[PDB]
Design a protein around this ligand. Sequence first.
Ligand SMILES: Cc1[nH]c(NC(=O)c2cc(CNC(=O)C(C)C)cnc2C(F)F)nc1-c1ccc(C(F)(F)F)cc1
Ligand SMILES: Cc1[nH]c(NC(=O)c2cc(CNC(=O)C(C)C)cnc2C(F)F)nc1-c1ccc(C(F)(F)F)cc1
Ligand SMILES: Cc1[nH]c(NC(=O)c2cc(CNC(=O)C(C)C)cnc2C(F)F)nc1-c1ccc(C(F)(F)F)cc1
Ligand SMILES: CCCCCCCCO[C@@H]1O[C@H](CO)[C@@H](O)[C@H](O)[C@H]1O
Ligand SMILES: CCCCCCCCO[C@@H]1O[C@H](CO)[C@@H](O)[C@H](O)[C@H]1O
Ligand SMILES: CCCCCCCCO[C@@H]1O[C@H](CO)[C@@H](O)[C@H](O)[C@H]1O
Ligand SMILES: CCCCCCCCO[C@@H]1O[C@H](CO)[C@@H](O)[C@H](O)[C@H]1O
Ligand SMILES: CCCCCCCCO[C@@H]1O[C@H](CO)[C@@H](O)[C@H](O)[C@H]1O
Ligand SMILES: CCCCCCCCO[C@@H]1O[C@H](CO)[C@@H](O)[C@H](O)[C@H]1O
Ligand SMILES: N[C@@H](CCC(=O)N[C@@H](CS)C(=O)NCC(=O)O)C(=O)O
Ligand SMILES: N[C@@H](CCC(=O)N[C@@H](CS)C(=O)NCC(=O)O)C(=O)O
Ligand SMILES: N[C@@H](CCC(=O)N[C@@H](CS)C(=O)NCC(=O)O)C(=O)O
Lengths: 148, 148, 148
Amino acid sequence: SLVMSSPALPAFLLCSTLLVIKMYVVAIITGQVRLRKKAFANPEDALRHGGPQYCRSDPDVERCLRAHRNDMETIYPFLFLGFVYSFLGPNPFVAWMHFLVFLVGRVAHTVAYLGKLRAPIRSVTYTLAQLPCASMALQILWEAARHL
Amino acid sequence: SLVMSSPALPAFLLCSTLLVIKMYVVAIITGQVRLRKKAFANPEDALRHGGPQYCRSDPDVERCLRAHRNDMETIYPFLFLGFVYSFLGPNPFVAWMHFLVFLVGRVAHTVAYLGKLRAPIRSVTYTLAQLPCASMALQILWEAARHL
Amino acid sequence: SLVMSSPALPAFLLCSTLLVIKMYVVAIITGQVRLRKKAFANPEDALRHGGPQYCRSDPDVERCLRAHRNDMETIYPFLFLGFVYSFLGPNPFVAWMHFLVFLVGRVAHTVAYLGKLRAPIRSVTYTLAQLPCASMALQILWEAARHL
Ligand SMILES: Cc1[nH]c(NC(=O)c2cc(CNC(=O)C(C)C)cnc2C(F)F)nc1-c1ccc(C(F)(F)F)cc1
Ligand SMILES: Cc1[nH]c(NC(=O)c2cc(CNC(=O)C(C)C)cnc2C(F)F)nc1-c1ccc(C(F)(F)F)cc1
Ligand SMILES: Cc1[nH]c(NC(=O)c2cc(CNC(=O)C(C)C)cnc2C(F)F)nc1-c1ccc(C(F)(F)F)cc1
Ligand SMILES: CCCCCCCCO[C@@H]1O[C@H](CO)[C@@H](O)[C@H](O)[C@H]1O
Ligand SMILES: CCCCCCCCO[C@@H]1O[C@H](CO)[C@@H](O)[C@H](O)[C@H]1O
Ligand SMILES: CCCCCCCCO[C@@H]1O[C@H](CO)[C@@H](O)[C@H](O)[C@H]1O
Ligand SMILES: CCCCCCCCO[C@@H]1O[C@H](CO)[C@@H](O)[C@H](O)[C@H]1O
Ligand SMILES: CCCCCCCCO[C@@H]1O[C@H](CO)[C@@H](O)[C@H](O)[C@H]1O
Ligand SMILES: CCCCCCCCO[C@@H]1O[C@H](CO)[C@@H](O)[C@H](O)[C@H]1O
Ligand SMILES: N[C@@H](CCC(=O)N[C@@H](CS)C(=O)NCC(=O)O)C(=O)O
Ligand SMILES: N[C@@H](CCC(=O)N[C@@H](CS)C(=O)NCC(=O)O)C(=O)O
Ligand SMILES: N[C@@H](CCC(=O)N[C@@H](CS)C(=O)NCC(=O)O)C(=O)O
């Protein structure tokens, strides 16, 4: 199997795939919040679910959308960076640590966001998860530059 | 050519690339709607195209933006998942089916969204396209976990 | 090192990684603008930083968010397209030109957006950066189709 191409790759693919599933969960939650609070973005949805007055914003829906958007701002770059990084032959334990800190930080971020935890808990989880991304980005820069 | 690295890869790259082009089309449509309805997000744009009163929101522009955002929530994870999945040696016909259901589901989603089709047509196309993504995600999880 | 898998790959990884770092910079700027203008998206953030009245929108914050979102609409597809394209054996100089035009166009786009430059400067930088993406997309389509 091509998951054996590099020692860090299986750990990367496990953590990345879990985070994609975590984003799908946020999408599902968002939909459930829309249905339960009757707050739809489109008139066609609202008219199916009670009438035109349910085409409206809602603070819990907006919060879900922000959590999902922040995921797209951070998890998507990790998908790219962590994949490339997996092929630069980093120490396997060190790679594991980058991926684990990102995974735990991002899961905690979503819990802190949707659970409305006090500041600066969410902000800290964001920063902690960004550290391994910044680290991987720099390492890729050096490897790319030196092969020019 | 490295498109021969796995039997499912050419089908994946065809479907993914078509969907990226489909997102570019949504961007172009969004711009056309802004120009035609004179609804710009920035004062600098509005002042070039008729005056400061054209810095305003518009429901058709907002609809285009939602379609584009939903694309980013679903097509981007597919780009990652479908690529990795292509290298796990799935049955070629089964892989084709995952990619085709995603492609047709997503194209139909954009048509349903921008064409303002009645509920739950859009919601159904979303769910149908998510099925192959969920399937690929699970398969990747198993392959990654077993190589740890 | 696997950065030697194709002659265009190091140039791609340099430009892509710089653009990911450029998006992180936009995130950091956005946070600084929120703190300095006291415009927070969440009540929990606002209550930590002066009171509930600082849970409010702000035009500079909204501008930062639009710049970041436009990045996600354009840089993320480039991450996918430029990676695949790097493996299709394009002329190395021609590949360099695609990646450089995208890099310069996107950096200029963010400068034009956040610096509030007059129209159509931002719009031109967007279009110029989309050209190499469109070109790569087409080339991938042809390579994928011909291997079906
Ligand atoms: C019957 C139905 N209704 C709806 N949806 C709605 O009424 C709806 C839901 C939401 C909230 N969003 C979500 O929760 C997402 C995460 C799914 C928003 N707007 C609407 C609007 F469309 F009314 N879907 C199905 C469905 C049917 C068959 C399948 C299948 F045949 F595939 F099994 C699948 C789905
Ligand atoms: C002359 C011009 N104007 C504008 N744009 C605007 O006036 C404009 C447009 C929109 C809508 N967005 C779109 O439709 C997107 C999808 C392109 C929004 N805001 C503005 C604002 F800038 F006014 N662009 C060019 C252009 C020129 C040369 C090239 C080149 F030299 F590359 F050929 C390219 C473009
Ligand atoms: C003490 C603190 N405060 C905050 N954040 C806030 O008070 C805050 C900031 C913003 C603006 N966003 C940003 O600027 C982003 C780009 C970071 C918005 N909302 C809040 C809200 F949480 F109040 N963070 C830390 C922090 C502590 C330790 C670490 C560590 F231990 F990791 F060193 C890291 C961070
Ligand atoms: C990956 C998905 C994780 C989902 C996190 C769920 C957090 C829900 O947490 C709950 O949220 C409620 C409303 O915000 C609060 O009233 C409750 O105090 C809190 O327990
Ligand atoms: C604001 C504080 C800066 C945090 C940056 C954390 C990124 C550290 O990243 C580190 O950078 C080193 C130098 O490039 C590399 O040699 C290491 O491999 C890398 O882990
Ligand atoms: C990939 C791009 C697909 C674009 C889908 C275009 C759907 C347009 O469809 C049209 O939309 C109009 C306004 O919404 C409606 O008034 C019309 O009834 C409908 O035909
Ligand atoms: C809410 C209903 C759940 C829909 C989940 C659809 C995903 C099915 O996905 C399937 O999962 C199996 C078990 O992991 C795998 O063996 C299959 O290869 C995979 O196609
Ligand atoms: C990659 C990050 C690039 C950041 C671009 C910074 C552009 C800031 O540019 C400044 O913006 C101010 C407010 O918009 C204006 O008042 C100033 O005229 C302008 O110099
Ligand atoms: C609106 C004007 C259209 C701009 C499209 C620019 C994309 C050009 O892209 C070019 O397409 C050719 C034909 O497929 C390929 O042979 C070239 O390799 C490719 O660079
Ligand atoms: N787009 C972000 C940029 C900065 C950022 O990502 N901040 C983290 C830590 S405060 C966050 O959780 N932001 C909340 C969000 O994106 O909604 C924002 O507007 O806050
Ligand atoms: N961000 C989505 C999460 C759920 C989702 O993706 N739902 C599908 C099926 S109803 C959809 O088309 N949503 C419309 C949208 O994203 O604007 C939302 O707010 O609706
Ligand atoms: N989502 C975009 C689609 C079109 C686009 O990307 N346009 C470029 C050139 S005008 C841009 O810079 N848009 C500003 C933005 O995305 O906020 C929009 O609403 O404008």
